[PDB]
Ligand binder design. Sequence first.
Ligand code: A1BRT
Ligand code: ZN
Length: 140
Amino acid sequence: SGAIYVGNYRVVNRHLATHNDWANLVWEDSSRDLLVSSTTAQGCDTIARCDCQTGVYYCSSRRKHYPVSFSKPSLIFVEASEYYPARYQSHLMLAVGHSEPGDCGGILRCQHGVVGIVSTGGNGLVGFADVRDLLWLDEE
Ligand SMILES: COc1cccc2c1CC[C@H]2N1C[C@@H](C(N)=O)CCC1=O
Ligand SMILES: [Zn+2]
């Protein structure tokens, strides 16, 4: 589990969104595994606006933050899970690292701020849903 709290937005994995998230929906995209809902309180996270390929992510199944090198956001084939059939997921970045299903929502960050959240895993790889192209998270 986990979310990004930027401005009056809460960014979560679409597959982990709550009824309150759907009832206060701003934007959602199944192909990216992302959903954004509105919040009453202002958040403290800042979004990175960069093309970094190195950063650090939080792994709840180890209680640890790991430094990783990750690929550029791309269209990647992801195997069937309890949340999605086998499909192409867009704006996904891969790194070598430990992940388990409940690690989804952990933040990946670089020197500029939050880059994305854990979205997929298995086989010693971890995939992150990028949020750096969502410029509207910084306003309104
Ligand atoms: C961090 O999220 C995960 C980590 C480990 C396992 C899994 C997740 C998300 C779902 C689940 N999953 C991953 C799929 C894949 N990407 O290879 C294959 C089958 C499967 O059940
Ligand atoms: Zn950066």
